[PDB]
Design an enzyme around this catalytic site. Structure first.
Site, PDB file in Angstrom:
ATOM      1  N   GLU A  63       5.960   6.208  14.331  1.00  0.00           N
ATOM      2  CA  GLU A  63       4.148   5.419  14.195  1.00  0.00           C
ATOM      3  C   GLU A  63       4.848   3.872  14.133  1.00  0.00           C
ATOM      4  O   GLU A  63       5.626   3.574  12.934  1.00  0.00           O
ATOM      5  CB  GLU A  63       3.728   6.404  12.940  1.00  0.00           C
ATOM      6  CG  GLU A  63       2.444   5.406  12.651  1.00  0.00           C
ATOM      7  CD  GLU A  63       1.398   5.324  13.932  1.00  0.00           C
ATOM      8  OE1 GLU A  63       1.493   6.546  14.850  1.00  0.00           O
ATOM      9  OE2 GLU A  63       0.279   4.337  13.875  1.00  0.00           O
ATOM     10  N   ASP A  91       3.985  10.867  13.637  1.00  0.00           N
ATOM     11  CA  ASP A  91       4.329  10.374  12.996  1.00  0.00           C
ATOM     12  C   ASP A  91       5.692  10.011  12.456  1.00  0.00           C
ATOM     13  O   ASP A  91       6.046   8.766  12.544  1.00  0.00           O
ATOM     14  CB  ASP A  91       3.763  10.373  11.598  1.00  0.00           C
ATOM     15  CG  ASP A  91       2.294  10.500  11.873  1.00  0.00           C
ATOM     16  OD1 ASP A  91       1.672   9.527  13.024  1.00  0.00           O
ATOM     17  OD2 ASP A  91       1.162  11.035  11.127  1.00  0.00           O
ATOM     18  N   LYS A 117      -5.773  19.008  13.309  1.00  0.00           N
ATOM     19  CA  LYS A 117      -4.522  18.760  13.906  1.00  0.00           C
ATOM     20  C   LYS A 117      -3.830  20.258  14.785  1.00  0.00           C
ATOM     21  O   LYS A 117      -3.041  20.322  15.530  1.00  0.00           O
ATOM     22  CB  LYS A 117      -3.708  18.034  13.444  1.00  0.00           C
ATOM     23  CG  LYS A 117      -4.078  16.312  13.217  1.00  0.00           C
ATOM     24  CD  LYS A 117      -3.311  15.433  13.682  1.00  0.00           C
ATOM     25  CE  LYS A 117      -3.098  14.183  12.728  1.00  0.00           C
ATOM     26  NZ  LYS A 117      -4.224  13.568  13.326  1.00  0.00           N
TER      27      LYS A 117
HETATM   28  O1  LIG Z   1      -0.717   8.506  16.583  1.00  0.00           O
HETATM   29  C1  LIG Z   1      -1.025   8.343  15.735  1.00  0.00           C
HETATM   30  N1  LIG Z   1      -1.668   6.535  16.997  1.00  0.00           N
HETATM   31  C2  LIG Z   1      -2.332   5.784  16.694  1.00  0.00           C
HETATM   32  C3  LIG Z   1      -1.941   4.412  17.933  1.00  0.00           C
HETATM   33  C4  LIG Z   1      -3.533   4.764  18.498  1.00  0.00           C
HETATM   34  C5  LIG Z   1      -4.319   2.672  18.174  1.00  0.00           C
HETATM   35  C6  LIG Z   1      -5.230   3.344  18.622  1.00  0.00           C
HETATM   36  C7  LIG Z   1      -5.855   3.699  20.015  1.00  0.00           C
HETATM   37  C8  LIG Z   1      -5.416   4.664  19.718  1.00  0.00           C
HETATM   38  C9  LIG Z   1      -4.387   5.045  19.395  1.00  0.00           C
HETATM   39  O2  LIG Z   1      -5.578   5.655  20.877  1.00  0.00           O
HETATM   40  C10 LIG Z   1      -6.000   7.054  20.614  1.00  0.00           C
HETATM   41  C11 LIG Z   1      -6.720   7.206  19.226  1.00  0.00           C
HETATM   42  C12 LIG Z   1      -8.221   6.851  18.600  1.00  0.00           C
HETATM   43  C13 LIG Z   1      -8.747   6.660  17.609  1.00  0.00           C
HETATM   44  O3  LIG Z   1      -8.379   5.464  16.730  1.00  0.00           O
HETATM   45  C14 LIG Z   1      -8.031   6.777  15.266  1.00  0.00           C
HETATM   46  C15 LIG Z   1      -8.490   6.040  14.518  1.00  0.00           C
HETATM   47  C16 LIG Z   1      -8.343   6.491  12.824  1.00  0.00           C
HETATM   48  C17 LIG Z   1      -6.959   7.605  13.151  1.00  0.00           C
HETATM   49  C18 LIG Z   1      -6.449   7.490  14.169  1.00  0.00           C
HETATM   50  C19 LIG Z   1      -6.688   6.674  15.567  1.00  0.00           C
HETATM   51  C20 LIG Z   1      -4.705   7.818  14.267  1.00  0.00           C
HETATM   52  N2  LIG Z   1      -4.378   7.449  15.097  1.00  0.00           N
HETATM   53  C21 LIG Z   1      -2.439   8.021  15.085  1.00  0.00           C
HETATM   54  C22 LIG Z   1      -2.529   9.799  14.534  1.00  0.00           C
HETATM   55  O4  LIG Z   1      -1.361  10.142  14.255  1.00  0.00           O
HETATM   56  C23 LIG Z   1      -3.504   9.846  13.689  1.00  0.00           C
HETATM   57  O5  LIG Z   1      -3.730  11.182  12.136  1.00  0.00           O
HETATM   58  N3  LIG Z   1      -4.645   8.995  13.669  1.00  0.00           N
HETATM   59 MN   LIG Z   2      -0.891  10.965  12.176  1.00  0.00          MN
HETATM   60 MN   LIG Z   3       0.983   8.555  14.441  1.00  0.00          MN
END
Ligand SMILES: O=C1NCCc2cccc(c2)OC/C=C/COc2cccc(c2)-c2nc1c(O)c(=O)[nH]2
Ligand SMILES: [Mn+2]
Ligand SMILES: [Mn+2]
Ligand SMILES: C[C@H](C[C@@H](C[C@H](C[C@@H](C[C@@H](CCN1CCCC1=O)N1CCCC1=O)N1CCCC1=O)N1CCCC1=O)N1CCCC1=O)N1CCCC1=O
Length: 178
Positions: A63, A91, A117
């Site tokens: 990540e 991650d 998840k």
């Molecule tokens: O790996 C990850 N990558 C997120 C990188 C990203 C940035 C912007 C947009 C995205 C991807 O589009 C897909 C998700 C859109 C919804 O935005 C949220 C909001 C809050 C948490 C997360 C994502 C979240 N991201 C991950 C996780 O592993 C995780 O557990 N939670």
């Molecule tokens: Mn995550």
């Molecule tokens: Mn992630």
């Protein structure tokens, strides 16, 4: 947007820029999607604390990298250790336990997020570890990977961010958002 100013003063500048760079990669602007801006910053901070709780270079940080570069290191780990490639980007990777780690930070029930998840990543070989803003945690097969002290700091920091959002009256809009 109030929430934006709080994010810049609560999180480390490099973490804020990383969440900005990650959101702009997926066509999301942190100036309007401020609740998502705080969630990605929180998820980025927890992941960095999680890898810091190991030993020297126990973990490989996935990540925070570019989508193309993150999948490049994932392919390198799968082609050198032999683990199954995950359908979704994890991650971290535990070089000690030989498994990918999937870290989640929840505002609702900690018991629920795992169910989301778990039913998503079909590759059950990768580990799963959920942290909660209330101070709870839930890991795969009760294997919490980190030491008790390392996880306790993540819970403490998670509750500190919760108090700061409520102190400025943004916790309710942020909790009732995922
Ligand atoms: O790996 C990850 N990558 C997120 C990188 C990203 C940035 C912007 C947009 C995205 C991807 O589009 C897909 C998700 C859109 C919804 O935005 C949220 C909001 C809050 C948490 C997360 C994502 C979240 N991201 C991950 C996780 O592993 C995780 O557990 N939670
Ligand atoms: Mn995550
Ligand atoms: Mn992630
Ligand atoms: C390596 C570099 C950036 C790292 C991100 C991460 C940040 C690390 C900083 C440490 C020092 N602490 C701790 C106290 C304050 C501080 O400053 N922590 C950990 C806790 C919070 C934090 O901030 N780490 C870990 C290695 C050294 C480093 O800086 N990242 C980004 C994703 C991949 C990665 O490894 N990289 C790599 C290439 C692009 C880039 O920028």
């Amino acid at each position: 947007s109030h929430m934006e100013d709080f994010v810049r003063q609560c999180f480390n500048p490099m973490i804020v820029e990383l969440a900005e760079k990650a959101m702009k990669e997926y066509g999301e602007d942190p100036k309007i999607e401020t609740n998502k801006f705080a969630a990605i910053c929180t998820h980025l901070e927890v992941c960095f604390m999680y890898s810091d709780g190991g030993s020297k270079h126990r973990f490989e940080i996935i990540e925070g990298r570019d989508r193309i570069m993150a999948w490049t290191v994932v392919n390198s780990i799968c082609n050198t250790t032999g683990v199954e490639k995950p359908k979704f980007l994890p991650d971290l990777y535990d070089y000690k336990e030989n498994r990918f780690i999937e870290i989640g930070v929840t505002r609702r029930e900690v018991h629920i997020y795992y169910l989301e998840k778990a039913n998503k990543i079909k590759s059950e070989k990768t580990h799963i570890h959920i942290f909660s803003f209330t101070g709870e945690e839930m890991a795969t097969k009760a294997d919490y990977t980190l030491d008790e002290e390392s996880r306790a700091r993540i819970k403490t920091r998670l509750f500190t961010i919760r108090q700061e959002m409520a102190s400025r009256s943004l916790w309710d809009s942020f909790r009732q958002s995922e």
